[PDB]
């Protein structure tokens, strides 16, 4: 539909496989995206896509709500735990931000820090997919 | 016990964390290895460790049985499907070889080819751990 998918998912492979898809509605596009993401792209592609995002607490818009409500204290712990999380899991903390505060997200990060690396990899994959779905609606609603 | 663990697991992190472990029996060492492998090292470390191995059908000893029973035909499909598997999953096909034939392993590879990349990542992690356990016994039995 438009290889501007590298923006709608930092995964080159996902963008590629989507670029060559027989155009469909805004609904079928969602379903075809999830199947490719969850069953076709490999772990390496998931990692590329995660890296494309700014950490939670930095800027590069899903974070508008969090910034319209942030605090130096939240931005502080955040900048610190992001470092801790990257060291432990190998990729940055991924979460679909939106109506979320930096405080709630800092808490979700601390919480998730205690997961096994393999499980954090599944949760991030899911959070990434939600972000992608969110951005696809923005392309089809327009 | 001896940072020669990079040989007993291509993971630098796993080797590191093990190098600084209060010496224990051949049994406690196994259990401490599994916990570190499954709950401490990240996906990136799993990937480093997989890469350290020769593909099934190539040489760099767990493969002695398979070579004492191989065939040009098995070595052929193998060399081909290994390429296909790497393309799809992002890492080579990992399996504890031993009393296994290239034929049985070629079949396990074709079978596993139909798994979701995330699941192949778990199976490889487990196969890798079995290989590691196998090699640790060889260090403590000596
Ligand atoms: N850190 C992190 O997950 N950032 C991503 N999440 C989101 O909603 N937008 C992003 O860029
Ligand atoms: N391909 C692959 O898993 N090779 C590994 N397995 C094993 O038993 N020894 C290896 O080096």
Swiss-Prot record, chains A, B:
Disruption phenotype: Longer hypocotyls and roots, as well as greater fresh weight due to plant growth promotion. Enhanced sensitivity to brassinosteroid (BR) in term of plant growth regulation. Increased freezing tolerance to cold treatment. The double mutant b1l ttl exhibits a developmental phenotype and freezing tolerance comparable to the single mutant ttl. Residues 1-142 are annotated as: OHCU decarboxylase. (S)-allantoin binds at residues 53-54, 62, 93, 95, 97. The active site is at residue 53. It is found in: Cell membrane; Peroxisome. Expressed ubiquitously with highest levels in flowers buds and elongating inflorescences. Phosphorylated by BRI1 in vitro. Residues 1-24 are annotated as: Required for BRI1-binding. Induction: Not regulated by plant steroids. In the N-terminal section; belongs to the OHCU decarboxylase family. Homodimer. Forms tetramers. Interacts with BRI1 in a kinase-dependent manner. Interacts with B1L. Involved in the last two steps of the degradation of uric acid, i.e. the hydrolysis of 5-hydroxyisourate (HIU) to 2-oxo-4-hydroxy-4-carboxy-5-ureidoimidazoline (OHCU) and its stereoselective decarboxylation to (S)-allantoin, a major ureide compound. Might function as a negative regulator to modulate brassinosteroid-mediated plant growth. Together with B1L, prevents plant growth and development, but by opposition to B1L, negatively regulates cold tolerance, probably in a brassinosteroid (BR) and allantoin-dependent manner. The N-terminal 29 amino acids are essential, but not sufficient, for the interaction with BRI1. This is Uric acid degradation bifunctional protein TTL. It comes from Arabidopsis thaliana (Mouse-ear cress). The lineage of its organism: Eukaryota, Viridiplantae, Streptophyta, Embryophyta, Tracheophyta. The chain holds residues 6 to 160 of 324 of the full protein.
């Amino acid at each position: 539909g438009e290889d501007e998918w590298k923006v709608c998912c930092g995964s080159s492979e996902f963008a590629k496989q989507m670029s060559t898809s027989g155009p469909l509605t805004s609904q079928e596009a969602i379903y075809t995206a999830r199947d490719i993401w969850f069953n076709q792209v490999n772990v390496t592609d998931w990692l590329e896509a995660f890296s494309a995002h700014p950490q939670i607490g930095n800027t590069p818009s899903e974070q508008s709500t969090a910034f319209a409500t942030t605090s130096a204290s939240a931005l502080q712990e955040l900048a610190e735990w992001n470092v801790l999380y990257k060291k432990k899991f190998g990729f940055i903390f991924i979460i679909c931000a939106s109506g979320r505060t930096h405080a709630e997200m800092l808490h979700a990060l601390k919480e998730r820090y205690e997961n096994r690396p393999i499980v954090e990899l599944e949760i991030a994959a899911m959070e990434q997919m939600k972000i992608t779905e969110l951005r696809m609606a923005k392309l089809f609603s327009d």
